[PDB]
Amino acid sequence: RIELGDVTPHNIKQLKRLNQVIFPVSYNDKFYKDVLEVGELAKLAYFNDIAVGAVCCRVDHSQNQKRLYIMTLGCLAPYRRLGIGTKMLNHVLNICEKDGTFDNIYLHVQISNESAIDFYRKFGFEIIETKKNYYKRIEPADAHVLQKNL
Amino acid sequence: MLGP
Ligand SMILES: CC(C)(COP(=O)(O)OP(=O)(O)OC[C@H]1O[C@@H](n2cnc3c(N)ncnc32)[C@H](O)[C@@H]1OP(=O)(O)O)[C@@H](O)C(=O)NCCC(=O)NCCS
């Protein structure tokens, strides 16, 4: 019942709508312009042909490493615990497995996001750091950095 | 969740 699809100018508004509802932090027009330029690093998740989730990633060059950073990976609350998040994460893991040049995958979550910690830790991710005041106008502002070594 |  869950299918992933490409992010295009035809459905980019549906992606902005999902991110607005799922994530307390707002993203600028440049974030969404860049999402159309990353290819397989951005997908929509459909539950019975309804768009209910999305994943947006970018390549990062930090720590003298080639890393895949997950900017947003989310699902609408009533559709949670159905495997949508797993479908999106396995897609990113598969891309990295086939690419073979990424050293690690990493992301940021609020320290209060127990469901996100639980989800990522099931895939081999570890909390490698806790960054104080990472988020600016929301509480908690502190964020864990979750990373999976490849 | 990226913090922009
Ligand atoms: C984290 C998130 C994406 C998970 O999506 P999801 O579709 O519910 O995840 P899945 O259904 O694939 O869950 C897979 C496994 O992760 C773990 N998990 C996910 N949510 C959990 C929860 N709320 N409590 C305990 N474990 C959880 C479980 O092991 C689960 O397997 P199970 O359902 O067989 O027990 C979702 O909670 C969400 O959209 N959160 C809001 C945005 C966000 O915080 N994103 C994370 C930062 S990128």
Name the residue ranges covered by the structural domains of chain A. 1-150
Q: Is the CB of B1 less than 8 angstroms away from the CB of A69? A: no
Q: In whole angstroms, give the CA distance from residue A71 to residue A103.
A: 17
Cα dihedral: A110, A115, A120, A122 (round 10): 150
Mutate to test the pocket of ligand 1, among A47, A109, A115 (most ligand atoms within 8 A of CB): A115
- Dihedral sign, CA of A22, A93, A134, A109? positive
Superfamily name and number for A1-150 = Gcn5-related N-acetyltransferase (GNAT) (3.40.630.30)
Give the 3-state DSSP-derived string for A68-113, with helices as H, strands as E and coil as C: EEEEEEEECHHHCCCCHHHHHHHHHHHHHHHHCCCCEEEEEEECCC
- Cβ neighbours of residue B2 under 8 Å, at least 6 residues apart? A25, A27, A31, A69, A71, A72, A108
Q: In whole angstroms, give the CA distance from residue B4 to residue A93.
A: 24
Q: In whole angstroms, give the CA distance from residue A114 to residue A72.
A: 16
Per this entry, what is the length of chain B?
Answer: 4
- How many other C-beta atoms are found inside a 10 Å radius of the C-beta of residue A7? 22
Cα dihedral: A37, A62, A23, A9 (round 10): 0
- The response to whether A133 counts as a known ligand-binding position is no
- Cβ neighbours of residue A128 under 8 Å, at least 6 residues apart? A106, A145, A146, A147
Q: To what resolution in angstroms was this structure determined?
A: 2.3
Pairing label, strands A65-75, A104-110: parallel
The residue of chain B with its CA nearest to that of A24 is: B1
Q: Tell me if A118 CB under 6 Å of ligand 1.
A: yes
Pairing label, strands A65-75, A50-62: antiparallel
Experimental determination technique? X-ray
Beta-carbon-side half-sphere exposure of residue A36 (alpha carbons within 13 Å): 12
Tell the residue nearest (CA) to atom 40 of ligand 1. Answer: A74
* Residue A103, both tokens: 């050293």
- How many other C-beta atoms are found inside a 10 Å radius of the C-beta of residue A85? 24
End-to-end distance of chain B based on CA atoms, in angstroms? 9
Element (H, E) at A61: strand A50-62
- Alpha carbon of A134: minimum distance to chain B alpha carbons (Å): 7
